[PDB]
């Protein structure tokens, strides 16, 4: 569960280069009494990392995208969510600009992705 840092190397570059770096940096990045306390604290780090990863996979489990690094769902865009030519999306923007831009539509998209499993 130490691959959370390797996500961040593609910040600043645009969305297509980051989408390639997803697959590339995912494939490449894979008895004294005072010592048992160190063993227990390192296990409490590792098991916490495993539980945070499983919670992040369970939140992708609602939407039918558990385990998939990239999935393509069945919820059509109402085009009042970034009414923009998607060449400009995948070439002129970074991910921080998306988290800023569609921030007021993201709970709506999450509700639709939950409701489109029924």
């Amino acid at each position, epitope marked *: 569960g130490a691959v959370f840092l390797g996500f961040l190397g593609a910040a600043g570059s645009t969305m297509g280069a980051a989408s390639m770096t997803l697959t590339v940096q995912a494939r490449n990045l894979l008895h004294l009494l005072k010592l048992t306390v160190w063993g227990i604290k390192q296990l409490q780090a590792r098991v916490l990392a495993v539980e945070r990863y499983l919670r992040d996979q369970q939140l992708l489990g609602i939407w039918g995208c558990s385990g998939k690094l990239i999935c393509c769902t069945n919820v059509p865009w109402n085009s009042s969510w970034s009414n923009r030519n998607l060449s400009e999306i995948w070439d002129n923007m970074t991910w*921080l*600009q998306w*988290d*800023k831009e569609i*921030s007021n539509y993201t709970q709506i998209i999450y509700g639709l992705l939950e409701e489109s499993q029924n």
Partner: nanobody
Amino acid sequence: QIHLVQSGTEVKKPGSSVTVSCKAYGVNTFGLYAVNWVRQAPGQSLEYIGQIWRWKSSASHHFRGRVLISAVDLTGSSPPISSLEIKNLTSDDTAVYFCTTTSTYDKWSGLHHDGVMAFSSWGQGTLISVS
């Protein structure tokens, strides 16, 4: 507690230059904040001029080559000063000028969109007449 203060009312000649000061009391630095100079012709609506966000001076396409926007940080005995110089004045620049400052510290704020900003804190008005 920004208490941004400008200079006083001025009048010049056509075909000349002018300079308007903007002292930024209560501003940490211009690395964190960003200064947007804007103007208003008498009776009209507010017309953008330029900015110096992240120490990159830039003016709009209407005003290129005629306008210089400079800044000195909070050093020593003086607060951060922005300044607006206009070369080759015409009689159609008689207007109330404003320097504005907004905070660019938080990326997920909403007051700014990649260097295009809402004007969260304002000056008080520098009228320039041209005769």
